[PDB]
Design a protein around this ligand. Structure first.
Ligand SMILES: [K+]
Ligand SMILES: [K+]
Ligand SMILES: [K+]
Ligand SMILES: [K+]
Ligand SMILES: [K+]
Ligand SMILES: [K+]
Ligand SMILES: [K+]
Ligand SMILES: [K+]
Lengths: 468, 463, 463, 468
């Protein structure tokens, strides 16, 4: 490891057009100083592999404002209006990439694996091609993503994804010892860790440089072999994007969703209703929440004094962890998710099809912020996928239908749908089975609000509500 | 995580014929209590996915002694007499898999990746198939290994390897907290960590159970989500398993550069590290999961959890790190090690290497050799006596012995010559031992070679 | 073979949604009676595997008019207005497949081969997938084509293509004997022959039923084992469907050599053959299954069974031969044609070729173009106007239009220059039109090129 | 096409070590003159791709006698003792290659297909590797064949086979016109036709050169484009290897096998019992016999005056064809066979396993003549495979057993077994079902003579015998 006292010296040789991996999940674990140094070098036309787009004037957003980015390879790019502006205007290319796939392709790029198979994205625009990479002024697609090959292994379809390697990686870490070994703090690890292994030149900025021997050898997150350039960050804002702090019909969906929890369960809860449901978990029930940004053991929102920019949930809100929690990298988080280790994935949806296809990441020409980890979260047949959503849309437009009309997040991946009117079990071959019916409504009422048929359980019961 | 007080209770339901992942590298990080428990359950016909075969009466060797293993899927199986006997007798199936490949296949198995590509094994028997997995009584072949598909990416050939999942994993770890999070000690991590993620039921034995909160969350090596069953092991044995050449060693010693990351094979390469100048910093990587190897320990510092890839007890230097086997081989396959220096039986004109299989009915396996030479980015230097016993050539047009890799060697150092190797141009003699002539080299080399116009007498480290 | 007297009876059991192979190239060798019978049965939602789309109200076009086709799997679909309308409107699925690939996939489908490799389509949209198979009402894409795997053999890239089998095949043939052996006439053989082997139920319509023994056993093109149902067609329409440039033609004419086998594309290459010396023997291969193309026929010699690849009625010369489409493309893919000369929209520096798709929502298909340039052994010469309308470059660093093949062009002849193309070195200007200078060429060429030290004024055939 | 008046001039440039495709099936369609010319050139160390080994001093055998062949790629090499001598002595390398695979690999080598999949050989030493290519003096294996990759398509396993191309092809044909177009006579076509397309230089010898226009364009078997060198053969012996001519317990198996025929059936009958069974076909029943050397419509053995060396069956016996017969090449014959167009394949076997594995091509260190087309003939799930064999071996050693002990011809490919004691239907999952029992024997008698269990049909009947 070569140590630098000036961030600009560490990045002055990045060529225009370089592919640069940039660490961070939201504004958590972003290489603020290295990004600031790129602003000064003015290097242009970068292909930035960055999970997110920071926010308008922060993180990658700074490089978007300066128009230094030609293309982004990212999983979720919401909360950055300049990003959206450039994207929709055709000034910026964006490959929306499933978060787990992004993490695993980056890992592959550091691990000598040129390609690998994953079921994430199978049956979606990622596999099929046609995801917009570049738009035309008029909202038409100028460059569309290319299809990924599909191959069946063990009776299931997977798509072939290729390694991502960068010319440089700009990585944020917590401490480096004097030998260049590096550790990451809490959830700020995320993509920084695998990105440190996947670029010709890795540049790491750290908050503190400590003596060699400061780390237990077993607990060096990133061995020095991967750290080519190291700079101590001149300053850190650690901007908190979303401050969530606890004190000291939708409710119907939430209270029924809360009954999906079981003791000892590992769950990943999407923003909104699913997460709100966790609030009703029995104190006598232990549920471990997994956060795809690399945390196992999410706790409640922080009391004001527990707020920590390095600890946020997947919805980018400041959070806390419970005793016995663990942090891990993004590639590990998605290995955990794709490998079906999480027992329950509960998320909102725009549409669900009769056999369980899910649409919850894109509305053509309206909502184009990426799928985040959604495609990975529903990719495992081992993980129960529960969709929680209002039964119908605007004009009582159907949301549960024969076939989704919006881009799919996954095919035949939903196992249960909970709405304010019904709970349906979903079978990928037999379809829907109404198993709970809100009191007051009739099976015929559900028929009227559902765009496909469904079997009625012979043991159909009144819809349950958590008692807490 | 479900805690158990009796190891047998934790493994009593393993089915006969189950595929069981068993952690450990050599005798380092082996689940000795879980293995002892299988001896009690008597489960049979196991397909043991285990990097090595323990030793005769220890580690996996206990299950071979009790004939509870039908097949081993391993990378190196030396140092086990009963294993040899059963394999030669046709009583045991042995499927050799490169060590990095084994690690990555297991990791894939817990990561939702059914298959992936690797350079490791391309151009060898791993890709070709055909290795004797099982013999019949008459010594004929009963089962041969299967080939792997080949596909090119960015100009290079890779082979497709598939995920390994087991029905069970028997994992050894250091500590578990009361929530079931687990950590591994020193180099005992190796395969235990990825194996914990790749089986339907993971059973972990630990040396100590600690309070929740004992670990920094950042430093939990295996989060509890992967730990299904946990037992504190009842007994831990801490078993410890363990001039021509001089000229080669002293020339090999000159391959080191300051700040270099190197992986040195057993034998001459490792001996060469003894000549590194105290003024030069070289970080030695060990494929079983260590970066920063130091000298052998004084006897009172021997630590069963810290061995090098040759299973020798070792020490580490300041700033060393430990990591799992899948990470170690991601490090190696990714070209992060600058120099891989190893011995060889033969090297071909364009750099094919044969260094893992001496013909004979017995197999020991390739260990990490195929991975170590798999990257175009890592300089591979072979250090070997120039010619074989009898004087047959070791450097030739094409190897006749099983390949470890194709066009993977960049330099050959013998006691007679140093050759640079180029996969397209072949050999260039760049150094020549005093007293020998280019013609002497020609006579003892089985292929042509260019003579560098800057050919110098062979160098020798001053240390 | 079961004989039928009513075509409807022979096809009444085709299931809705069936995949039906339909013979014919253009209107040559189409099962017009079987198609007329499907109009009567009303079977719907067919996946028609048909090289072409007939014309508006004939051949496959009848089934498009009646909306009985859900998807076409074809290689070229021009000259059909209703096809265009349905495709653009999103009422029809169109899956373009290279013509040689279509033939080989069908042959595989009857030969027990589930998949095989071909150079054809490597590096194009065929390999990449992404072509619009079906549009939605708003003009957005409903279905896109799937990619094909790529694998290297002996240094070259190929793609994996899978067998095509149908539930039924509607085959047109010339004669059947009373045993059900069948023969095909002239170029009407094309896809009929392999399609007869690739469906669960083959239905063949013939022009004449002859006595057993009418054929020499050696000369039965399709043995009866492949003919499940046979009907004599009731009606056969014998429908017949059908200076800058001069300088290019006269220079292209100089690419011919005595004894050469060439395949000449529609347009300039074919026109160049008019300048072949009566003293030179050139055998023109037609991809629809002919070797030995002759001049266009006088009107009273027009024969609906004999057309060239551009669907022009043609004649053949003495010693000509006919063969099926799978054989024709085995001939082409195998490099047996010495010269393939065709037009192009763009050619890249190292010889990538774009010549089959003009962007626009409409698709016509690649026909046999991708196969024709698929062999390293066949010399591929592009004859094209040097620059595009507007003066944009046609020869450039990289094509911007869809590729027909990568690094497949060996020579480019324009009205300004002749370039040799090498896939590694790029372009070499070897001939230069009178009055133009190397700088004029540089200004109208989008990439650099070497200038041959033997550059001569551009040659022109004397004929 | 370049015409030569001297065969030696046509082949004088074949280099030592060349791979030479040599046409012919048995002594039918062999390039006698070109082989004679190679004897004079003395070219050595050839890799001869030749379906068979001719006979001791004829066909390829001439080149084996002269020791000009280093390796043979062949499907059946019986009837040549010098061949066997060299093979067993380690003086000759031999890749035993399934006949259909050989034909299809040669076709691929001429058709631009580098590799393709086939189920022929799946589950055998061809797929697994280990077929002896070169022996050691002591009968041990010195060079073993390498495995072929396996891949599943549409629920079935196939193995990847690569194209075969030669430096030269020595092809025998019937006539050539003056332009070089070529035709083949009767069954002498076989491998000559595809071999003509799969070599850098094709050399064809013909019996007669005729005028251009002699052939109907539609009936040119091999267009001139494939014929690089053409010589009119100086002389032709057309040696008949096996003269079979008709005049003017085993019988039990034969008479029961004869009941497997159905009207309109296409069948391929192996040598011995199956072929003898065809003799009992009802004159009122039309059965089309397919010959894998390229004939459809086999008839009886020839009357003496009908004997024709160009027309032999797969067992190399002189034969006749019935009206409406057709001839075709070896690659087409095996496309017909592998594509399941033949309805019934009936052949002898050494062993059959409980689930239908068949062993009928090799006895290690005893019978090593190759599989001929056996592996292809049982490769199609569409073709009914009926094994006809004596129930038990020598010491009442079992032939029908749990698992074959001899090298397999195919796995789970047999559908019915007919012996002199029983008829078993075979199901690849449920095993054997005794459906006919010879009178006099009891189910227990069968149990004693069968090495595996079997269900007894509830409708078990006395074994039938054809009444003719
Ligand atoms: K699921
Ligand atoms: K799914
Ligand atoms: K290297
Ligand atoms: K290599
Ligand atoms: K070419
Ligand atoms: K090419
Ligand atoms: K069968
Ligand atoms: K089978």
């Amino acid at each position: 490891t070569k140590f630098y006292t000036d961030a600009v010296e560490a990045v002055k040789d990045i060529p225009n057009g370089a592919t640069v991996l940039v660490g961070g999940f939201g504004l958590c674990g972003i290489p603020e100083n290295l990004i600031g140094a790129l602003l000064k070098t003015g290097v242009k036309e970068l292909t930035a592999v960055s999970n997110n787009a920071g926010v308008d004037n922060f993180g990658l957003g700074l490089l978007l404002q300066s128009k230094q980015i030609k293309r982004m390879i990212s999983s979720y790019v919401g909360e950055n209006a300049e990003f959206e502006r450039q994207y929709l205007a055709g000034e910026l290319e964006v490959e929306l990439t499933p978060q787990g796939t992004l993490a695993e392709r980056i890992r592959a790029g550091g691990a000598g694996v040129p390609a690998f198979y994953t079921s994430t994205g199978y049956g979606t625009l990622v596999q099929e091609g046609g995801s917009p990479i570049k738009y035309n002024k008029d909202g038409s697609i100028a460059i569309a993503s290319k299809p990924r090959e599909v191959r069946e292994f063990n009776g299931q379809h997977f798509i072939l994804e290729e390694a991502i390697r960068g010319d440089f990686a700009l990585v944020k870490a917590w401490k480096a010892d004097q030998a260049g070994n590096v550790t990451f703090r809490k959830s700020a690890r995320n993509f920084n860790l695998p990105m440190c292994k996947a670029a010709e030149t890795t540049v790491v900025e750290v908050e503190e440089i400590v003596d060699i021997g400061s780390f237990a050898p077993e607990d060096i997150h990133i061995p020095k072999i991967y750290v080519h350039r190291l700079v101590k960050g001149e300053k850190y804002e650690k901007r908190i994007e979303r401050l969530s702090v606890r004190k000291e019909v939708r409710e119907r969906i939430i209270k029924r969703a809360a009954l999906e929890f079981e003791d000892g369960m590992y769950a990943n809860l999407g923003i909104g209703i699913p997460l709100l449901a966790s609030n009703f978990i029995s104190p006598n029930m232990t549920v471990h929440l997994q956060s795809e940004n690399g945390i196992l053991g999410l706790g409640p929102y922080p009391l004001q004094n527990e707020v920590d920019a390095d600890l946020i949930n997947a919805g980018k809100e400041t959070v806390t962890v419970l005793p016995g929690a663990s942090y891990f990298s993004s590639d590990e988080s998605f290995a955990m998710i794709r490998g079906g280790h999480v027992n329950l994935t509960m998320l909102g949806a725009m549409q669900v099809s009769k056999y369980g296809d899910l649409a919850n990441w894109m509305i053509p020409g309206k909502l184009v912020k990426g799928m985040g980890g959604a495609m990975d979260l529903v990719s495992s047949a081992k993980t129960k996928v529960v969709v929680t959503m209002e039964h119908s849309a605007k004009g009582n437009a159907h949301k549960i239908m024969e076939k989704c009309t919006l881009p799919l997040t996954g095919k035949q991946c939903v196992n249960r749908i909970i709405t304010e009117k019904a709970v349906f079990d979903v079978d990928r071959k037999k379809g829907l089975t109404l198993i709970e019916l809100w009191e007051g409504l009739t099976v015929d009422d559900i028929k009227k609000s559902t765009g496909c048929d469904f079997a009625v359980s012979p043991k159909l019961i009144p819809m349950q509500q958590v008692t807490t």
